[PDB]
Amino acid sequence: LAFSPPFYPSPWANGQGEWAEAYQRAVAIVSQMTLDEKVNLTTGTGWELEKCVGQTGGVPRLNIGGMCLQDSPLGIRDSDYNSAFPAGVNVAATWDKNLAYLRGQAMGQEFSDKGIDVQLGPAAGPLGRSPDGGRNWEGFSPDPALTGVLFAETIKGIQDAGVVATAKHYILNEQEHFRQVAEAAGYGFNISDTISSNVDDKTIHEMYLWPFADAVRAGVGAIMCSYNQINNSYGCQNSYTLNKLLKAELGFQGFVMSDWGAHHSGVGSALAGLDMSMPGDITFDSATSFWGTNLTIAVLNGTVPQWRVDDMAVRIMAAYYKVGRDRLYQPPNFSSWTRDEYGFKYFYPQEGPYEKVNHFVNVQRNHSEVIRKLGADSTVLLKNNNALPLTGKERKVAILGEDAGSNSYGANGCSDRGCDNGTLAMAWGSGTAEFPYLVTPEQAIQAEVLKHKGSVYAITDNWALSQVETLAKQASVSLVFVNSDAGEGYISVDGNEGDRNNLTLWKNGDNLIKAAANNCNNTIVVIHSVGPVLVDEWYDHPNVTAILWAGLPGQESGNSLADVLYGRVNPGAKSPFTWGKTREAYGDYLVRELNNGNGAPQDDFSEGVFIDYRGFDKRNETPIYEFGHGLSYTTFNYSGLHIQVLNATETGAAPTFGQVGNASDYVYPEGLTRISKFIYPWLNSTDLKASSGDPYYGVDTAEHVPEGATDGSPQPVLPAGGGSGGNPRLYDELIRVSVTVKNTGRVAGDAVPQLYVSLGGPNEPKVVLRKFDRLTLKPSEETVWTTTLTRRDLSNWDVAAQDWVITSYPKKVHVGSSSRQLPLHAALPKVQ
Amino acid sequence: LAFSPPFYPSPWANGQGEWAEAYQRAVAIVSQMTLDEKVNLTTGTGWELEKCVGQTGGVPRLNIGGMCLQDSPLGIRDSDYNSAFPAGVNVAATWDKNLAYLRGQAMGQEFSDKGIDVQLGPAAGPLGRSPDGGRNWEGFSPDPALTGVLFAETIKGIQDAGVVATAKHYILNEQEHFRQVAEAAGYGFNISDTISSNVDDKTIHEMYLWPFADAVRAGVGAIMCSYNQINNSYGCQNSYTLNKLLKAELGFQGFVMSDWGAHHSGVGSALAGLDMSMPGDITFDSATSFWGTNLTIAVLNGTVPQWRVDDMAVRIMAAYYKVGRDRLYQPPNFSSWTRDEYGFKYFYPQEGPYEKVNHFVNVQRNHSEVIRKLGADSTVLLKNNNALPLTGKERKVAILGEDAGSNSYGANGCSDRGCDNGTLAMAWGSGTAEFPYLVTPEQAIQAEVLKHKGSVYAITDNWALSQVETLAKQASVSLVFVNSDAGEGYISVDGNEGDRNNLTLWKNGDNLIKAAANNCNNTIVVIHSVGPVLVDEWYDHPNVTAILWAGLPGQESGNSLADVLYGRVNPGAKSPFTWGKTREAYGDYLVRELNNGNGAPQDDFSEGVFIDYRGFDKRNETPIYEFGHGLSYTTFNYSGLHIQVLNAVATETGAAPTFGQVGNASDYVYPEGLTRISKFIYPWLNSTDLKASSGDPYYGVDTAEHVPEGATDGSPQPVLPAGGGSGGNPRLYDELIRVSVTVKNTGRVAGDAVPQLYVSLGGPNEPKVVLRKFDRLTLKPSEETVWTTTLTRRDLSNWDVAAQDWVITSYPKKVHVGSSSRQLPLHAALPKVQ
Numbered sequence A: 001l002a003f004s005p006p007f008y009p010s011p012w013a014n015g016q017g018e019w020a021e022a023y024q025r026a027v028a029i030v031s032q033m034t035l036d037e038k039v040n041l042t043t044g045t046g047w048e049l050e051k052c053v054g055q056t057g058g059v060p061r062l063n064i065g066g067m068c069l070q071d072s073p074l075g076i077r078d079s080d081y082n083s084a085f086p087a088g089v090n091v092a093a094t095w096d097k098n099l100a101y102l103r104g105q106a107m108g109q110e111f112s113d114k115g116i117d118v119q120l121g122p123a124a125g126p127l128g129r130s131p132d133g134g135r136n137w138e139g140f141s142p143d144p145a146l147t148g149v150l151f152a153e154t155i156k157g158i159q160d161a162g163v164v165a166t167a168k169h170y171i172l173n174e175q176e177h178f179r180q181v182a183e184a185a186g187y188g189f190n191i192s193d194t195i196s197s198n199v200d201d202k203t204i205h206e207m208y209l210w211p212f213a214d215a216v217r218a219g220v221g222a223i224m225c226s227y228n229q230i231n232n233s234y235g236c237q238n239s240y241t242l243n244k245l246l247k248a249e250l251g252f253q254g255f256v257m258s259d260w261g262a263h264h265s266g267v268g269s270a271l272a273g274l275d276m277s278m279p280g281d282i283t284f285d286s287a288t289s290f291w292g293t294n295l296t297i298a299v300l301n302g303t304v305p306q307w308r309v310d311d312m313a314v315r316i317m318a319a320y321y322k323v324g325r326d327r328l329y330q331p332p333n334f335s336s337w338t339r340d341e342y343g344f345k346y347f348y349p350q351e352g353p354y355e356k357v358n359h360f361v362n363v364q365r366n367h368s369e370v371i372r373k374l375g376a377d378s379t380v381l382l383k384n385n386n387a388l389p390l391t392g393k394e395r396k397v398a399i400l401g402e403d404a405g406s407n408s409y410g411a412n413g414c415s416d417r418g419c420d421n422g423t424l425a426m427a428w429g430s431g432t433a434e435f436p437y438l439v440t441p442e443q444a445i446q447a448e449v450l451k452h453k454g455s456v457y458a459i460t461d462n463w464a465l466s467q468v469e470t471l472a473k474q475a476s477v478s479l480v481f482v483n484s485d486a487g488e489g490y491i492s493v494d495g496n497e498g499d500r501n502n503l504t505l506w507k508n509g510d511n512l513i514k515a516a517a518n519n520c521n522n523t524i525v526v527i528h529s530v531g532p533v534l535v536d537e538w539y540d541h542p543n544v545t546a547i548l549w550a551g552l553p554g555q556e557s558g559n560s561l562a563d564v565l566y567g568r569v570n571p572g573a574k575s576p577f578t579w580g581k582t583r584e585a586y587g588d589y590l591v592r593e594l595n596n597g598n599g600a601p602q603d604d605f606s607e608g609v610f611i612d613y614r615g616f617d618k619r620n621e622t623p624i625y626e627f628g629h630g631l632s633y634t635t636f637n638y639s640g641l642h643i644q645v646l647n648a649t650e651t652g653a654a655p656t657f658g659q660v661g662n663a664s665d666y667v668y669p670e671g672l673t674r675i676s677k678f679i680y681p682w683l684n685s686t687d688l689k690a691s692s693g694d695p696y697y698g699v700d701t702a703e704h705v706p707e708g709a710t711d712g713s714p715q716p717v718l719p720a721g722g723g724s725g726g727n728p729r730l731y732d733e734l735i736r737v738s739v740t741v742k743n744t745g746r747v748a749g750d751a752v753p754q755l756y757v758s759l760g761g762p763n764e765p766k767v768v769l770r771k772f773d774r775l776t777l778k779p780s781e782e783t784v785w786t787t788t789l790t791r792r793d794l795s796n797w798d799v800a801a802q803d804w805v806i807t808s809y810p811k812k813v814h815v816g817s818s819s820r821q822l823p824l825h826a827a828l829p830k831v832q
Numbered sequence B: 001l002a003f004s005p006p007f008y009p010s011p012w013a014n015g016q017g018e019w020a021e022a023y024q025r026a027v028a029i030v031s032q033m034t035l036d037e038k039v040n041l042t043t044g045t046g047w048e049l050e051k052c053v054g055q056t057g058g059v060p061r062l063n064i065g066g067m068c069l070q071d072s073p074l075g076i077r078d079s080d081y082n083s084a085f086p087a088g089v090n091v092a093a094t095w096d097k098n099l100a101y102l103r104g105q106a107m108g109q110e111f112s113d114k115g116i117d118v119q120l121g122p123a124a125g126p127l128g129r130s131p132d133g134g135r136n137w138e139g140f141s142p143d144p145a146l147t148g149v150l151f152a153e154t155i156k157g158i159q160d161a162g163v164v165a166t167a168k169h170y171i172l173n174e175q176e177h178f179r180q181v182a183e184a185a186g187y188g189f190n191i192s193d194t195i196s197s198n199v200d201d202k203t204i205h206e207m208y209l210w211p212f213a214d215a216v217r218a219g220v221g222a223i224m225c226s227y228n229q230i231n232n233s234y235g236c237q238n239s240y241t242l243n244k245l246l247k248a249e250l251g252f253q254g255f256v257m258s259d260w261g262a263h264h265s266g267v268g269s270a271l272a273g274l275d276m277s278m279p280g281d282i283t284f285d286s287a288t289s290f291w292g293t294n295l296t297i298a299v300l301n302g303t304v305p306q307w308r309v310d311d312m313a314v315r316i317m318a319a320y321y322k323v324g325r326d327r328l329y330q331p332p333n334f335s336s337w338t339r340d341e342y343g344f345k346y347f348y349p350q351e352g353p354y355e356k357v358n359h360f361v362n363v364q365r366n367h368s369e370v371i372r373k374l375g376a377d378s379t380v381l382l383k384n385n386n387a388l389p390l391t392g393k394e395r396k397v398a399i400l401g402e403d404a405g406s407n408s409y410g411a412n413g414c415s416d417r418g419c420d421n422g423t424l425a426m427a428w429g430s431g432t433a434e435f436p437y438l439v440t441p442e443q444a445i446q447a448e449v450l451k452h453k454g455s456v457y458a459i460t461d462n463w464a465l466s467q468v469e470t471l472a473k474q475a476s477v478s479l480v481f482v483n484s485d486a487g488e489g490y491i492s493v494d495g496n497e498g499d500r501n502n503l504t505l506w507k508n509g510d511n512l513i514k515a516a517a518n519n520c521n522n523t524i525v526v527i528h529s530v531g532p533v534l535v536d537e538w539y540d541h542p543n544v545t546a547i548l549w550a551g552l553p554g555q556e557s558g559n560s561l562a563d564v565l566y567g568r569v570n571p572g573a574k575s576p577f578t579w580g581k582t583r584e585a586y587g588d589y590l591v592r593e594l595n596n597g598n599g600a601p602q603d604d605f606s607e608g609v610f611i612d613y614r615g616f617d618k619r620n621e622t623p624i625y626e627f628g629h630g631l632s633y634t635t636f637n638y639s640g641l642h643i644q645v646l647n648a649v650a651t652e653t654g655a656a657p658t659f660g661q662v663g664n665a666s667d668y669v670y671p672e673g674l675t676r677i678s679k680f681i682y683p684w685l686n687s688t689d690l691k692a693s694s695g696d697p698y699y700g701v702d703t704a705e706h707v708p709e710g711a712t713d714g715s716p717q718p719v720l721p722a723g724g725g726s727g728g729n730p731r732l733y734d735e736l737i738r739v740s741v742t743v744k745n746t747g748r749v750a751g752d753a754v755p756q757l758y759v760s761l762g763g764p765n766e767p768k769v770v771l772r773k774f775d776r777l778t779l780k781p782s783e784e785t786v787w788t789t790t791l792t793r794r795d796l797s798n799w800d801v802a803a804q805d806w807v808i809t810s811y812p813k814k815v816h817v818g819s820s821s822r823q824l825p826l827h828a829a830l831p832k833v834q
């Protein structure tokens, strides 16, 4: 069985780079704390005990309010009067650094104004190993360079607005199946531990880890570790991924929290790099914790060094001060668990004062504008046989497909979006927000047609083919809407347990499009979906005149789409994944059956880096629509490629901050009423063992503490660490590349030039994306696009050196409009 | 068994009043025609033989195009690029003569532009005897005065636009059950003849006939006779309703067409006063006709006098010239039967040249504006506890109910509107048109909220009550949409065979409303329906803060409603019928079982005039909302009632004329150069053998015994005491009393008042009050105006069966003026007038 080697001690923060000031302030405040106050920072107060999906008790004597952590990566979850933004996959489709940023900002502002201190997003894990993985749509793209950039921009947006962002899920949680034992049992499978992602060192550095190096370097304050194991060690106590990869090599200065139910030990996790336990209990409302009381005790009894808990508290405080959250603090002014104005202050046991729990704060501002725009700028025009844009003069418009219309239960009428009814604008699970409203395609397209005095109708029953066929024969244009949905594993829709059972359109989508196209010579297909779908049965139908994929556009869906169809917005989006002929063409199959008895199922990432386009190119398969493909209402020309060659070894000792006293200092204070199921830092009595309640307390302790886990002496700095996102020399710019880009068509719009390299050698992908931008050009206008290649951009990870190395194989650079349309290419000069 | 007494001969046209010129022109052309050409004018060509739901072959030698007759009373049926107007019952709710006229004008422009010569509407039959009758919504109100005025204004708008209007269904077709034999057999009922409406002579004159007198007087070109019998004689060969009441008494100068499949004899119908056979065959596509060839023969063999057939042709041509159809003539430029651009000229058999059958002519102009305005002005505010208008500042709006949402099959996705899915904007059967689009309440209300940056959702599944209650608890206002549908008898939705099985909200509507009201303290109910519904379980709920009835509003439904809810339009509409506590409170039960063995079911109208509010008042029952009830966003005051007495005809007809000549049987044999299209109905004979050309098993059997006395009498006739003018003796229209009252807007917002003038005619078997006059008046805050109207001799009379005339009885009469049939604060005794 795959094995995860140890890396100890857990590196301590050191004020690195842009962290120096936040770090000095965190040290100054943590220095004043008692041990039980530190422990309060590291541990949630129990599932649904307070307002937010995760919440710590804070440090009231020092005026630090409890930290409120709230889903989702696309808008506030479980709340009211908030916006519902387009999914991460749509931000990937925009290929637009500035939009990613502005979406981050607009979400940070909403969260901040609810009294939320930490946003649980954005996501870049799952990266997207498998096209049918249930949560890829929360993240960005199976491409690491595209994902890493947009992930970093999103983070900076949220954090510049004064909310800690949480880069999640770290790492390799690439499928929903078997991700949690209790979940897998509810679906009929008996496993003793969760799915183990088993991945080699080179692949993890070149693909899954790379967007997290970008997040760290961009200054992300939190990381959320994952439910899966990596080589049979749990994500939230994996010393290799946490202490070595994230903290020693990438130099992360912030804090690591567990996923909810992903904390599996007290001492083991603390020593392997975890900093925060969420939601704080061992199972939801168990009234027990692996930390809380247990972490106070582990420090009192000598097993967890004081320097390790000090370091947790300094990381947590430093991320809070880094975004300036102290200056924007207010208790959460809503409840995730009820919409009532009044309620008991502690929801789960219904205890504490009966008081106001929701203030109905409308934090939407004018955010509907960025959502509408982002929706339009993420709508990929995959095919257009001169059918779009529409003019508004079409005499009779047939809107066809349940995906055009309303969810009959209301836009929020499925808990956590857990259905596929009506237009698909948000997929399902925790990566969700309550819509303030939802503009459907039916609404916006019929309003547009009426403004021109046209005739128009929507048929929204996908088995009503007789009515579809009759109307399509009468119509000047048929706009056919289809979808494919997926979501987090705890919800099953039509037997899709989170992951998609297939890549085929839901609700009779293929047959609907064939019924329309059999009867109407101007059939235009609009897809809303979490990822790619199979189009092979109808994409090349002679009456199918255009095809668009619009992802998961959030609240302004119909308007984002009408802006594109009627030419208010010239589509610039490009596909952020591959559209293959068959599911087999993508390989990377999900693990769907037990393969290790009743132990943890083993998910070997045996393809290595060869996922999505890298896998199609390696198998010489031709996609229907390649990664990077999207059309425009204008045309662009790329020409004139020019290339130009451009001109600490040890840590400190681990510090301790403040002092630890006797057990008796940490016994529950006498005047305090203990709320049921609430997790506290205190001890029932000075008897450690009886106050822990742990059946293993004090047994074999030293043989269960890996070697070096309590070593607070100076440590070596790794060859590939010593910076933020890795050694600074990785970011030296070595080669400058330029091209001329001209709009040669008749409509202003955006080009997305893409620069790929070929690093060379028998095991390397033929091409890999490195740079891109999205550039606005009026008709006939030209611009020079210039970009640089870093040392990292030209390197491979060398497992023998434990470092990035520029290999001796000759390298090439390619520039064009997609991963398959690269008319400009050159040999790169040798650089090192 | 009820018996219908004979009345013969069938009165001939005479150029009465405003028909002088059209009759002279009709005479001049019919005088030039051959027998088979005259026959062509009277008989349709066969079910789906040509473009229109009914179509005659015309007179091509004289350049007279075939007459294209097309449904419906609310918009062109079976066509394309036309509008869908609100139903006639919304017109009633507006109480607005001007909107009734403008609706008729916009419909007539559309019909004319499609090359249609005759619109098959409007409808004042069914008047509305039973609140559950399947077609009352096509008409206006169970009140004759309200219906008659709006019927007449509708016909004038249509005719002034150059299209013949058809006042239908004449008469007493008050329910759908048992209306047609083969239809009843499809529902499992074996009957040998159609339901017989049996009604006394006073009742028919005071109620059902009265809007037909207004139609005739307003110059209606055509009348369509009905499927039912009246006292066991079929509507389309009832000499008493046709010869006596319509043609002799009301003085009708135009033509009577059959309902489709309501023609039941050749000789008997022609002599009893039918003028046109639709769709022209005996049963659809039977390639046999009671007229056509049979009528040509019936004249050749001496059974039907030439003067009768000539009078048919003259009535049909006079109606055509009276509206100026000859100046607008074009063949119909669409087909009712396919939407294809090209097809065979003769649809049913797929024969004749292969050519253009559809030109896709966009006839809508800007008619969406009148539709939108009329929907708003027909929205009755029944309850408002200071909940409406909405301001736009509501923070979270819950739109609740399937009736707010789209039909998942598309707005036209149920053939002839034969389902109740999504928002109910049009009821079912032939009284329908294809929507060009349909704006739902969901669309219009969500757009309004988003304009204000509010939050808003629609839940459109009526059994998703868990989602409904959760949202309602979070809402600032809950707008709950409910409906009740019905339609023509040939369609059954959920076991409702045209007529409604009950007056209860469909699709779980009472449970929806209670699930919302149990949870929002600001629940507003919007009803779309064909007629009244039972509101007793929730109307008085403390959390139901407003209730509106919006009828069947046609294509702008959701915008019409938003106009009212957000106060762009102050609702002025008034209930055109009563909202009772129970179904029993209305009495007048439908006949739903065979009550005459396998013979014609018998429908005795034994309540006499006491239908709708007249029945509630007779029984001293309190409606929830009475006839004439509607609220406003302002208040009005009535004062200063005053009454002022004012200072206020051949006795024989001419002999029946003949125009042109009839020749030998050999003049009328099939022309030799002509391909006879299958199923097509022709006026021609196979051979000079009359008997064998007719193919009638009863040809020449006991002929004289089956020709009623007087039936061939072409000599001068007495003018009836109640006849001699248009819609009856012109003395009935003398104005005898002027009434005036001052109406003031005493509130803070402009609005329309609908003053209502009722009379009490006195006497032990008379309704306590009956409506006579009304108008709709726009007043600014504080503004006053003097509303002045006049009572005519007719208005003050009762029908005296012994005199056969209208009489002002000697019981003392009273005038009452106010805002509804129960809110009448002003009263005045009337002085004796005669």
Ligand SMILES: *[C@@H]1O[C@H](CO)[C@@H](O[C@@H]2O[C@H](CO)[C@@H](O[C@@H]3O[C@H](CO[C@H]4O[C@H](CO[C@H]5O[C@H](CO)[C@@H](O)[C@H](O)[C@@H]5O[C@H]5O[C@H](CO)[C@@H](O)[C@H](O)[C@@H]5O)[C@@H](O)[C@H](O[C@H]5O[C@H](CO)[C@@H](O)[C@H](O)[C@@H]5O[C@H]5O[C@H](CO)[C@@H](O)[C@H](O)[C@@H]5O)[C@@H]4O)[C@@H](O)[C@H](O[C@H]4O[C@H](CO)[C@@H](O)[C@H](O)[C@@H]4O[C@H]4O[C@H](CO)[C@@H](O)[C@H](O)[C@@H]4O)[C@@H]3O)[C@H](O)[C@H]2NC(C)=O)[C@H](O)[C@H]1NC(C)=O
Pocket: A003, A004, A005, A006, A007, A192, A193, A232, A233, A234, A237, A238, A239, A264, A265, A266, A267, A268, A269, A272, A289, A290, A291, A294, A295, A297, A298, A299, A301, A302, A303, A692, A694, A696, A697, A698, A699, A700, A701, A702, A703, A704, A705, A706
């Ligand atoms: C001061 O106060 C403190 C606070 O109160 C007191 O703290 C307690 O100290 C105890 C020891 O005194 C702790 O109890 C022991 O816990 C260990 C660790 O369990 C966790 O980690 C397991 C993985 O461990 C590896 O990795 C972690 C880091 O991730 C390392 O820290 C470990 O050292 C170990 O490292 C090796 O492997 C990695 C690669 O993976 C390498 O990189 C390293 O180089 C090393 O080679 C993990 O598997 C555990 O998972 C179990 O528990 C989860 C529930 O928490 C559950 O979800 C999992 O499914 C799994 O369940 C199964 O196991 C448990 C028992 O643990 C059963 O209850 C359950 O029913 C299932 O069977 C977990 O996350 C733990 O391994 C120890 O248990 C082993 O040893 C005891 C005997 O000593 C046996 O009785 C057990 O059966 C068990 O035996 C297995 O392991 C043996 C190898 O070790 C093997 O020989 C056996 O054959 C068998 O396979 C103890 O439970 C306690 O956690 C801690 N409490 C708190 C609150 O922190 C403290 O004692 C006090 N100090 C003083 C001085 O008084």
Ligand SMILES: *[C@@H]1O[C@H](CO)[C@@H](O[C@@H]2O[C@H](CO)[C@@H](O[C@@H]3O[C@H](CO[C@H]4O[C@H](CO[C@H]5O[C@H](CO)[C@@H](O)[C@H](O)[C@@H]5O[C@H]5O[C@H](CO)[C@@H](O)[C@H](O)[C@@H]5O)[C@@H](O)[C@H](O[C@H]5O[C@H](CO)[C@@H](O)[C@H](O)[C@@H]5O[C@H]5O[C@H](CO)[C@@H](O)[C@H](O)[C@@H]5O)[C@@H]4O)[C@@H](O)[C@H](O[C@H]4O[C@H](CO)[C@@H](O)[C@H](O)[C@@H]4O[C@H]4O[C@H](CO)[C@@H](O)[C@H](O)[C@@H]4O)[C@@H]3O)[C@H](O)[C@H]2NC(C)=O)[C@H](O)[C@H]1NC(C)=O
Pocket: B003, B004, B005, B006, B007, B192, B193, B232, B233, B234, B237, B238, B239, B264, B265, B266, B267, B268, B269, B272, B290, B291, B294, B295, B297, B298, B301, B302, B303, B694, B696, B698, B699, B700, B701, B702, B703, B704, B705, B706, B707, B708
């Ligand atoms: C020149 O050319 C012409 C063109 O070809 C030739 O025209 C043909 O003339 C024939 C006579 O020679 C016609 O045949 C006869 O028709 C009659 C009328 O039938 C229709 O009207 C019925 C109601 O009648 C009353 O009202 C009408 C006006 O509405 C009057 O015109 C009648 O005079 C009669 O008036 C009385 O009552 C009213 C009140 O209702 C009073 O106000 C008046 O004061 C009078 O009192 C009606 O009921 C008929 O309906 C039947 O047929 C429909 C299909 O058309 C169907 O939908 C109905 O359900 C119903 O079906 C039942 O009856 C028919 C037969 O008629 C059966 O086939 C069927 O299976 C059902 O049983 C219709 O709408 C008709 O009454 C005559 O038939 C009676 O008498 C014959 C024998 O003489 C019997 O064999 C019949 O069974 C029937 O008997 C009933 O009535 C008797 C009283 O007379 C009674 O004694 C019996 O007990 C019995 O129950 C004839 O069929 C033929 O219609 C006509 N063709 C065309 C195309 O116009 C003409 O001949 C030729 N000239 C010459 C010289 O050659």
Ligand SMILES: *[C@@H]1O[C@H](CO)[C@@H](O[C@@H]2O[C@H](CO)[C@@H](O[C@@H]3O[C@H](CO[C@H]4O[C@H](CO)[C@@H](O)[C@H](O)[C@@H]4O)[C@@H](O)[C@H](O[C@H]4O[C@H](CO)[C@@H](O)[C@H](O)[C@@H]4O[C@H]4O[C@H](CO)[C@@H](O)[C@H](O)[C@@H]4O[C@H]4O[C@H](CO)[C@@H](O)[C@H](O)[C@@H]4O)[C@@H]3O)[C@H](O)[C@H]2NC(C)=O)[C@H](O)[C@H]1NC(C)=O
Pocket: A036, A037, A040, A045, A056, A057, A058, A059, A060, A061, A066, A353, A671, A672, A673, A674, A675, A678, A681
């Ligand atoms: C880890 O995080 C957790 C979670 O955040 C932290 O736990 C929280 O800690 C808070 C203390 O920081 C503790 O707060 C207490 O709340 C009690 C309930 O307050 C609510 O109800 C009251 C009463 O109806 C309302 O007034 C109030 O506004 C709230 O709605 C308060 O009652 C406590 O107030 C007392 O202590 C504070 C100072 O902390 C005084 O200012 C206040 O006047 C009260 O003082 C009296 O009681 C204290 C002892 O508790 C005495 O020392 C003092 O002399 C006063 O004594 C008189 O009155 C008491 C009875 O009132 C009487 O018996 C005596 O004889 C005298 O007459 C305080 O506000 C939260 O409850 C707690 N949360 C939970 C879920 O447990 C935890 O501290 C963190 N740990 C660390 C190490 O940082």
Ligand SMILES: *[C@@H]1O[C@H](CO)[C@@H](O[C@@H]2O[C@H](CO)[C@@H](O[C@@H]3O[C@H](CO[C@H]4O[C@H](CO)[C@@H](O)[C@H](O)[C@@H]4O)[C@@H](O)[C@H](O)[C@@H]3O)[C@H](O)[C@H]2NC(C)=O)[C@H](O)[C@H]1NC(C)=O
Pocket: B036, B037, B040, B045, B056, B057, B058, B059, B060, B061, B066, B353, B674, B675, B676, B677, B680, B683
């Ligand atoms: C009663 O109404 C009936 C229905 O309107 C009348 O029947 C129609 O009478 C007309 C006028 O006489 C006939 O017209 C003829 O049609 C043929 C065929 O026309 C088409 O084909 C040719 C060649 O490809 C094409 O060139 C034409 O433009 C047409 O497209 C012509 O060839 C003749 O010259 C003549 O126009 C109709 O055919 C006929 N219709 C039917 C359904 O039978 C009937 O005349 C009326 N009777 C009375 C007494 O007035």
Ligand SMILES: *[C@@H]1O[C@H](CO)[C@@H](O)[C@H](O)[C@H]1NC(C)=O
Pocket: B686, B692, B693, B694, B695, B696
């Ligand atoms: C008249 O002639 C046609 C063609 O021969 C024949 O089909 C039809 O049956 C005849 N009509 C009658 C009443 O015989």
Ligand code: NA
Pocket: A517, A518, A519
């Ligand atoms: Na086809």
Ligand code: NA
Pocket: B517, B518, B519
């Ligand atoms: Na209640």
